[PDB]
Amino acid sequence: MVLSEGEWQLVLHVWAKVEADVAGHGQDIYIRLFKSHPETLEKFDRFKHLKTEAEMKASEDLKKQGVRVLTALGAILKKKGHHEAELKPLAQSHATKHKIPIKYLEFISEAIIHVLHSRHPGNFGADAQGAMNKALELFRKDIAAKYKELGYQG
Ligand code: HEM
Ligand SMILES: [O-]
């Protein structure tokens, strides 16, 4: 699905708030993901031992990974759909090495939306959330197509 420029601006206006503290947002998103869908934590060899939210919050390595995820996603969002180059390395590692199903990308998308909804009411009202969902649906659609090209059912 193709986003309008207005939709992209709603996406980028809340992403600007994430960027005040990408590390803190990444921690909240990972905690939400692992709490809501615990099976996703099992895909992380370095983090699957974490037992509680306190341990997740105290993990410097998890914090760094959160920053990587959100910075990679931010670069994709800033391309406003013209993210072919950015999806190549990401799809390859996630399909072949990490083996992350599309359903798990749906789960992290849900966690992103949940955290933006709680933190950023000023920039994440209904229309803004709809635009972000559209952007994440586009991301997942295009990643799923790349997964298939790479040989992974997803
Ligand atoms: C918005 C969706 C996501 C983005 C933008 C993203 C981005 C990244 C990036 C940039 C890296 C480091 C480089 C690489 O290996 O590709 C990474 C690593 C990884 N990703 Fe993702 N990721 C996403 C979703 C997920 C999900 C949902 C899972 C599992 C449920 C996952 C599992 C992993 C694992 C296991 C690693 C290796 C982590 C480590 O260094 O210990 N990713 N991801
Ligand atoms: O990730």
**What's the CATH code, domain 1-154?**
1.10.490.10
Domains in the chain: boundaries: 1-154
Let me know: does 152 contact 12? Beta carbons within 8 Å: no
Please state how this structure was obtained: X-ray
Q: Is 68 in the pocket of ligand 1 (CB under 6 A)?
A: yes
Which atom of ligand 1 is the closest one to the Cα of 73?
Answer: 5
For residue 20, report the phi and psi dihedrals to the nearest 5 degrees.
-65, -30
The count of other CB atoms within 10 Å of the CB of residue 87 is 19
Q: Is 17 in the pocket of ligand 1 (CB under 6 A)?
A: no
Per-residue burial over 29-54, b if 16 or more Cβ lie within 10 Å, else e, is bbbbbbeebeebbeebeebeebeeee
Q: Is 72 in the pocket of ligand 1 (CB under 6 A)?
A: yes
Q: What is the DSSP string of 32-62?
A: HHHHH-GGGGGG-TTTTT--SHHHHHH-HHH
Which atom of ligand 1 is the closest one to the Cα of 108?
Answer: 27
d(CA 112, CA 115): 5
Let me know: does 116 contact 129? Beta carbons within 8 Å: yes
d(CA 7, CA 76): 15
Q: What Cα–Cα distance (Å) separates residue 54 from each residue in 19, 50, 125? A: 23, 9, 30
